[PDB]
Short mmCIF file of C-alpha atoms in Angstrom, two decimals:
data_model
loop_
_atom_site.label_atom_id
_atom_site.label_comp_id
_atom_site.label_asym_id
_atom_site.label_seq_id
_atom_site.Cartn_x
_atom_site.Cartn_y
_atom_site.Cartn_z
CA UNK A 1 348.34 184.62 174.12
CA UNK A 2 345.73 182.95 172.48
CA UNK A 3 345.35 183.15 168.88
CA UNK A 4 342.87 181.06 165.79
CA UNK A 5 339.47 181.99 165.28
CA UNK A 6 337.29 179.90 162.64
CA UNK A 7 337.66 180.41 158.65
CA UNK A 8 335.72 178.61 155.79
CA UNK A 9 333.99 181.50 153.73
CA UNK A 10 336.74 182.04 151.14
CA UNK A 11 338.76 179.13 152.01
CA UNK B 1 335.86 184.56 158.94
CA UNK B 2 335.98 184.84 162.48
CA UNK B 3 339.35 186.36 163.77
CA UNK B 4 341.36 187.74 166.65
CA UNK B 5 342.49 186.72 170.48
CA UNK B 6 344.28 188.28 173.03
CA UNK B 7 347.84 188.98 173.60
CA UNK B 8 349.97 191.65 175.32
CA UNK B 9 352.13 190.35 178.11
CA UNK B 10 355.04 189.23 176.76
CA UNK B 11 354.70 191.25 173.22
CA UNK C 1 349.35 196.77 176.34
CA UNK C 2 346.54 193.72 176.19
CA UNK C 3 345.38 194.18 172.85
CA UNK C 4 342.89 192.14 170.37
CA UNK C 5 339.34 191.42 170.40
CA UNK C 6 336.94 189.53 167.90
CA UNK C 7 336.64 191.05 164.36
CA UNK C 8 334.65 189.16 161.27
CA UNK C 9 330.89 190.97 161.16
CA UNK C 10 332.40 193.87 158.88
CA UNK C 11 336.41 192.42 158.27
CA UNK D 1 333.13 192.82 166.78
CA UNK D 2 334.67 193.21 170.20
CA UNK D 3 336.90 195.74 170.42
CA UNK D 4 339.25 197.51 173.20
CA UNK D 5 342.03 196.24 175.77
CA UNK D 6 344.32 198.10 177.55
CA UNK D 7 347.00 200.67 176.14
CA UNK D 8 349.25 203.41 177.68
CA UNK D 9 352.54 201.65 178.25
CA UNK D 10 353.97 203.30 175.12
CA UNK D 11 351.26 205.79 174.15
CA UNK E 1 347.67 207.36 181.29
CA UNK E 2 346.10 203.92 181.36
CA UNK E 3 343.44 203.88 178.44
CA UNK E 4 340.79 201.85 176.95
CA UNK E 5 337.76 199.49 178.12
CA UNK E 6 335.41 197.10 175.75
CA UNK E 7 332.79 197.62 173.52
CA UNK E 8 331.01 195.94 170.38
CA UNK E 9 327.47 194.92 171.38
CA UNK E 10 325.54 198.10 170.33
CA UNK E 11 328.72 199.55 168.51
CA UNK F 1 330.19 199.07 176.84
CA UNK F 2 333.22 200.00 180.09
CA UNK F 3 335.21 203.28 179.42
CA UNK F 4 337.51 205.28 181.72
CA UNK F 5 340.84 204.26 183.16
CA UNK F 6 343.72 206.23 184.80
CA UNK F 7 345.23 209.76 184.60
CA UNK F 8 347.64 211.80 186.26
CA UNK F 9 350.86 211.97 184.39
CA UNK F 10 350.67 215.32 181.65
CA UNK F 11 347.33 215.87 183.29
CA UNK G 1 346.10 214.03 191.22
CA UNK G 2 345.48 210.22 190.30
CA UNK G 3 342.16 210.37 188.14
CA UNK G 4 339.65 208.39 186.29
CA UNK G 5 338.07 204.92 187.38
CA UNK G 6 335.31 203.28 185.37
CA UNK G 7 331.67 204.07 183.90
CA UNK G 8 329.54 202.22 181.48
CA UNK G 9 326.92 200.71 184.11
CA UNK G 10 324.04 203.48 183.54
CA UNK G 11 326.03 205.20 180.83
CA UNK H 1 330.34 203.32 187.56
CA UNK H 2 333.89 203.06 189.93
CA UNK H 3 334.86 206.42 191.23
CA UNK H 4 338.00 208.42 193.04
CA UNK H 5 341.36 208.71 192.87
CA UNK H 6 344.18 210.25 195.07
CA UNK H 7 344.01 213.96 195.61
CA UNK H 8 345.70 216.53 197.87
CA UNK H 9 348.80 217.78 196.53
CA UNK H 10 347.29 221.08 194.54
CA UNK H 11 344.28 220.83 196.69
CA UNK I 1 347.11 215.89 203.19
CA UNK I 2 346.77 212.69 200.68
CA UNK I 3 342.81 212.17 200.08
CA UNK I 4 341.03 209.76 197.97
CA UNK I 5 340.17 206.13 197.49
CA UNK I 6 337.56 204.22 195.33
CA UNK I 7 333.66 204.28 195.48
CA UNK I 8 331.09 202.94 193.27
CA UNK I 9 329.90 199.61 195.31
CA UNK I 10 326.96 201.06 197.13
CA UNK I 11 327.06 204.16 195.03
CA UNK J 1 334.46 201.42 199.18
CA UNK J 2 338.17 201.69 200.02
CA UNK J 3 338.70 204.94 202.16
CA UNK J 4 341.80 206.80 204.03
CA UNK J 5 344.72 208.66 203.16
CA UNK J 6 347.56 210.34 205.32
CA UNK J 7 347.56 213.45 206.94
CA UNK J 8 349.71 214.88 209.85
CA UNK J 9 352.10 217.00 207.89
CA UNK J 10 349.86 219.94 208.91
CA UNK J 11 347.44 218.86 211.67
CA UNK K 1 353.43 212.16 213.27
CA UNK K 2 351.47 210.80 210.07
CA UNK K 3 348.57 209.12 210.89
CA UNK K 4 346.05 206.86 208.58
CA UNK K 5 346.22 203.94 206.20
CA UNK K 6 343.30 202.15 204.09
CA UNK K 7 340.31 200.67 205.42
CA UNK K 8 337.14 199.32 203.54
CA UNK K 9 338.38 195.88 203.36
CA UNK K 10 336.86 194.43 206.58
CA UNK K 11 334.81 197.52 207.35
CA UNK L 1 357.00 223.23 200.47
CA UNK L 2 355.27 220.63 198.23
CA UNK L 3 357.08 219.27 195.14
CA UNK L 4 356.91 216.48 192.91
CA UNK L 5 354.37 215.09 190.58
CA UNK L 6 354.19 212.85 187.96
CA UNK L 7 356.55 212.06 185.34
CA UNK L 8 356.64 209.50 182.19
CA UNK L 9 354.25 210.77 179.57
CA UNK L 10 357.02 212.56 177.62
CA UNK L 11 359.95 210.95 179.67
CA UNK M 1 357.54 204.52 183.51
CA UNK M 2 355.48 206.46 185.56
CA UNK M 3 357.97 207.93 188.03
CA UNK M 4 358.06 210.66 191.00
CA UNK M 5 356.02 211.19 194.42
CA UNK M 6 355.43 213.63 196.68
CA UNK M 7 357.76 215.38 198.55
CA UNK M 8 358.79 218.58 201.17
CA UNK M 9 356.52 217.80 204.08
CA UNK M 10 360.31 217.09 205.80
CA UNK M 11 362.45 218.54 203.22
CA UNK N 1 357.72 211.62 201.43
CA UNK N 2 355.33 209.42 199.09
CA UNK N 3 357.33 206.90 196.36
CA UNK N 4 356.66 204.43 193.33
CA UNK N 5 354.76 204.62 190.19
CA UNK N 6 354.90 201.89 187.72
CA UNK N 7 357.35 200.03 185.42
CA UNK N 8 357.45 197.24 182.97
CA UNK N 9 356.45 199.03 179.67
CA UNK N 10 360.11 198.87 178.01
CA UNK N 11 361.44 196.74 180.92
CA UNK O 1 355.79 192.27 184.25
CA UNK O 2 354.13 195.39 185.60
CA UNK O 3 355.74 196.49 188.77
CA UNK O 4 355.34 198.81 191.30
CA UNK O 5 352.79 200.44 193.62
CA UNK O 6 352.86 203.45 196.13
CA UNK O 7 355.04 203.72 199.59
CA UNK O 8 356.28 206.23 202.13
CA UNK O 9 354.01 205.98 205.08
CA UNK O 10 356.67 203.74 206.94
CA UNK O 11 359.51 203.48 203.79
CA UNK P 1 347.84 183.58 182.40
CA UNK P 2 347.84 186.95 183.99
CA UNK P 3 347.99 186.98 187.48
CA UNK P 4 348.52 190.20 190.60
CA UNK P 5 345.98 192.66 191.34
CA UNK P 6 346.51 195.39 194.24
CA UNK P 7 346.51 195.23 198.00
CA UNK P 8 347.22 197.42 201.10
CA UNK P 9 343.85 197.34 202.45
CA UNK P 10 343.99 194.59 205.21
CA UNK P 11 347.77 194.02 204.35
CA UNK Q 1 351.86 201.19 201.18
CA UNK Q 2 349.84 200.34 197.79
CA UNK Q 3 351.49 197.00 196.59
CA UNK Q 4 351.11 194.55 193.66
CA UNK Q 5 350.84 195.21 189.55
CA UNK Q 6 350.37 192.15 187.02
CA UNK Q 7 352.96 189.32 186.32
CA UNK Q 8 352.56 186.25 183.68
CA UNK Q 9 354.82 187.27 180.71
CA UNK Q 10 357.87 184.86 181.85
CA UNK Q 11 355.89 183.63 185.28
CA UNK R 1 337.10 176.84 180.13
CA UNK R 2 338.73 180.94 179.89
CA UNK R 3 338.51 181.76 183.70
CA UNK R 4 338.99 184.66 185.61
CA UNK R 5 337.61 188.48 185.90
CA UNK R 6 338.22 191.04 188.34
CA UNK R 7 336.94 190.89 192.46
CA UNK R 8 337.48 193.40 195.41
CA UNK R 9 333.94 194.89 195.39
CA UNK R 10 332.44 192.87 197.71
CA UNK R 11 334.65 190.36 198.42
CA UNK S 1 342.10 194.54 197.87
CA UNK S 2 341.45 193.81 193.85
CA UNK S 3 341.72 190.62 193.05
CA UNK S 4 342.07 188.17 190.07
CA UNK S 5 343.59 187.90 186.54
CA UNK S 6 342.70 185.86 183.56
CA UNK S 7 343.65 181.87 182.81
CA UNK S 8 342.62 178.66 180.70
CA UNK S 9 345.09 178.01 177.63
CA UNK S 10 347.39 175.67 179.88
CA UNK S 11 344.59 175.18 182.60
CA UNK T 1 333.33 192.68 189.87
CA UNK T 2 333.65 191.85 186.30
CA UNK T 3 332.77 188.36 186.03
CA UNK T 4 332.24 185.44 183.69
CA UNK T 5 334.45 184.06 180.87
CA UNK T 6 333.70 180.49 179.02
CA UNK T 7 333.11 177.20 180.30
CA UNK T 8 332.17 174.00 178.66
CA UNK T 9 335.71 171.87 178.13
CA UNK T 10 334.56 169.50 181.15
CA UNK T 11 331.19 171.00 182.45
CA UNK U 1 327.18 173.18 175.38
CA UNK U 2 329.48 176.07 175.41
CA UNK U 3 328.51 178.67 178.30
CA UNK U 4 329.28 181.96 179.72
CA UNK U 5 329.87 185.50 178.46
CA UNK U 6 330.82 188.71 180.36
CA UNK U 7 329.15 190.90 183.28
CA UNK U 8 329.41 193.33 186.23
CA UNK U 9 329.02 196.88 185.28
CA UNK U 10 324.98 197.17 186.47
CA UNK U 11 325.54 193.56 188.37
CA UNK V 1 326.55 192.43 179.61
CA UNK V 2 326.83 189.64 176.98
CA UNK V 3 324.96 186.80 177.08
CA UNK V 4 324.29 183.32 175.01
CA UNK V 5 326.53 180.34 173.80
CA UNK V 6 326.23 177.36 171.98
CA UNK V 7 324.04 174.40 172.45
CA UNK V 8 322.99 171.12 170.93
CA UNK V 9 324.83 168.25 172.45
CA UNK V 10 322.02 167.68 175.12
CA UNK V 11 319.46 169.51 173.37
CA UNK W 1 320.80 170.87 165.70
CA UNK W 2 323.33 173.78 167.00
CA UNK W 3 321.49 176.43 168.53
CA UNK W 4 322.72 179.70 170.04
CA UNK W 5 324.34 183.27 169.35
CA UNK W 6 325.36 186.19 171.57
CA UNK W 7 322.60 188.95 173.23
CA UNK W 8 322.95 192.00 175.51
CA UNK W 9 322.70 195.07 173.02
CA UNK W 10 319.45 195.59 173.71
CA UNK W 11 318.82 193.16 176.28
CA UNK X 1 322.73 190.04 168.67
CA UNK X 2 324.73 188.07 166.77
CA UNK X 3 321.84 185.08 165.68
CA UNK X 4 322.01 181.79 163.77
CA UNK X 5 322.93 178.26 164.26
CA UNK X 6 323.00 175.25 161.93
CA UNK X 7 319.81 173.30 161.23
CA UNK X 8 318.59 170.40 159.10
CA UNK X 9 319.29 167.15 161.04
CA UNK X 10 315.11 166.15 161.29
CA UNK X 11 313.87 169.69 160.00
CA UNK Y 1 320.04 169.50 154.08
CA UNK Y 2 321.93 171.18 156.42
CA UNK Y 3 320.84 174.98 156.70
CA UNK Y 4 321.99 178.08 158.50
CA UNK Y 5 324.88 180.69 159.16
CA UNK Y 6 325.21 183.51 161.14
CA UNK Y 7 323.46 187.04 160.69
CA UNK Y 8 323.91 190.32 163.33
CA UNK Y 9 326.27 192.46 161.07
CA UNK Y 10 323.37 194.57 159.52
CA UNK Y 11 320.50 192.89 161.13
CA UNK Z 1 334.23 172.97 155.50
CA UNK Z 2 334.65 174.75 158.75
CA UNK Z 3 337.82 175.19 160.21
CA UNK Z 4 340.19 176.62 162.93
CA UNK Z 5 339.92 176.35 167.01
CA UNK Z 6 342.21 177.93 169.29
CA UNK Z 7 346.08 177.71 169.68
CA UNK Z 8 348.21 179.42 172.32
CA UNK Z 9 348.84 177.13 175.48
CA UNK Z 10 352.39 175.51 174.19
CA UNK Z 11 352.93 178.29 171.61
CA UNK a 1 316.76 157.54 158.25
CA UNK a 2 319.55 159.60 159.34
CA UNK a 3 322.06 158.65 161.64
CA UNK a 4 324.41 160.56 164.32
CA UNK a 5 323.90 163.68 166.64
CA UNK a 6 326.41 165.51 168.93
CA UNK a 7 327.44 163.41 171.79
CA UNK a 8 330.06 164.30 174.71
CA UNK a 9 327.58 166.31 177.37
CA UNK a 10 327.58 163.09 178.81
CA UNK a 11 330.05 160.79 177.48
CA UNK b 1 328.10 162.85 155.64
CA UNK b 2 329.06 165.19 158.02
CA UNK b 3 331.99 164.80 159.95
CA UNK b 4 334.07 166.58 163.07
CA UNK b 5 333.53 168.02 166.47
CA UNK b 6 335.79 169.75 169.17
CA UNK b 7 338.96 168.30 171.09
CA UNK b 8 341.44 169.62 173.35
CA UNK b 9 339.37 169.47 177.13
CA UNK b 10 341.53 166.72 178.13
CA UNK b 11 343.91 166.34 175.28
CA UNK c 1 344.66 173.75 171.82
CA UNK c 2 341.18 173.52 171.31
CA UNK c 3 340.90 171.73 168.13
CA UNK c 4 338.52 170.36 165.54
CA UNK c 5 335.62 172.04 163.10
CA UNK c 6 333.82 170.14 160.06
CA UNK c 7 333.95 168.23 157.46
CA UNK c 8 332.31 166.20 154.63
CA UNK c 9 331.91 168.60 151.83
CA UNK c 10 335.02 167.07 149.82
CA UNK c 11 335.60 164.27 152.47
CA UNK d 1 326.38 187.55 156.90
CA UNK d 2 327.38 184.26 156.91
CA UNK d 3 324.99 182.53 154.22
CA UNK d 4 324.98 178.78 152.99
CA UNK d 5 324.92 175.19 153.78
CA UNK d 6 325.34 171.48 152.04
CA UNK d 7 322.56 170.09 149.70
CA UNK d 8 322.10 167.27 147.45
CA UNK d 9 321.90 164.37 149.63
CA UNK d 10 318.03 163.63 148.73
CA UNK d 11 317.50 165.83 145.95
CA UNK e 1 325.82 165.97 144.13
CA UNK e 2 327.06 167.60 147.00
CA UNK e 3 326.13 171.34 146.36
CA UNK e 4 326.38 174.44 148.57
CA UNK e 5 329.40 175.85 150.71
CA UNK e 6 329.52 179.20 152.86
CA UNK e 7 329.24 182.55 151.40
CA UNK e 8 329.54 186.33 152.92
CA UNK e 9 332.96 186.77 152.16
CA UNK e 10 332.44 188.88 149.13
CA UNK e 11 328.36 189.36 149.13
CA UNK f 1 335.03 165.87 173.40
CA UNK f 2 332.08 166.89 171.21
CA UNK f 3 331.63 164.44 168.74
CA UNK f 4 329.17 162.73 166.57
CA UNK f 5 327.86 164.16 162.78
CA UNK f 6 325.53 162.99 160.46
CA UNK f 7 325.57 160.10 158.37
CA UNK f 8 322.73 157.63 156.34
CA UNK f 9 322.99 159.91 152.90
CA UNK f 10 324.96 156.53 151.40
CA UNK f 11 325.69 154.30 154.63
#
């Protein structure tokens, strides 16, 4: 399907 | 961060 | 089935 | 977050 | 049967 | 949100 | 028979 | 919401 | 015999 | 909404 | 014989 | 008279 | 899956 | 009589 | 996919 | 994506 | 009768 | 974008 | 009938 | 019905 | 920008 | 339902 | 700057 | 709901 | 400089 | 910084 | 002072 | 200084 | 898919 | 929630 | 110096 | 796509 998101707090 | 997505057709 | 959604608020 | 989906194919 | 739905705004 | 689904197999 | 539907407008 | 189904077996 | 359908557009 | 069914078994 | 069907699409 | 139902939940 | 139906109206 | 149901969970 | 439906008014 | 629905009122 | 279902896994 | 949903209540 | 589905990833 | 989705890529 | 959402239960 | 989005391109 | 979010729980 | 954004370009 | 982020989990 | 996005069209 | 912004709404 | 944005609408 | 993010804290 | 930012440009 | 970052992962 | 950023700090 669709996958992902948003990172950048820890990393 | 923010996580997730949608799936379920093939899997 | 149809699986997923959005997390990150608590986790 | 945003929770749910569709189940019943197995369970 | 077929089970589920959607939520997250209040809860 | 929205809730419900379809029953009638077991019940 | 076959039962269910969708709720979540008023409730 | 969305109401109904199929009856008429037992009843 | 077999009875039912769907409602909820008006009601 | 969506209306109808099947009669004629007895009547 | 059998009588009936499904309506509501047009009416 | 009438016979049938829905199987699939267990089997 | 979900299996069955209604018989008896003839047989 | 009435026939059908739903397949596609395993297969 | 998810396959099926209800027949028997003609077939 | 995913496609389909239910038919049988007009057709 | 009633027709349809869901596609989009392989198609 | 992400397009779709479910129709049929009025159309 | 009941119409729709989801897309947007490839198109 | 259930309406919406995400727009913005080209609009 | 990015626009959209989900609706339909009351509206 | 759920509303909102992201702005700041034009505005 | 960058503006927005999600509403719809209370309003 | 979910609030915030990014500021600081002019303010 | 650049300020903001996201709230809405507790508040 | 802020990382991520959406995958799922080709993969 | 500052240079830049967000483009792509028009161009 | 701050760099980035979003692609994927066309490419 | 949808590619990008924000950098400039280290780069 | 998600907090913070970037400073040190002027100060 | 370039100072800041994103917190909320632990606190 | 969505393009731009902030410069002028040191350039």
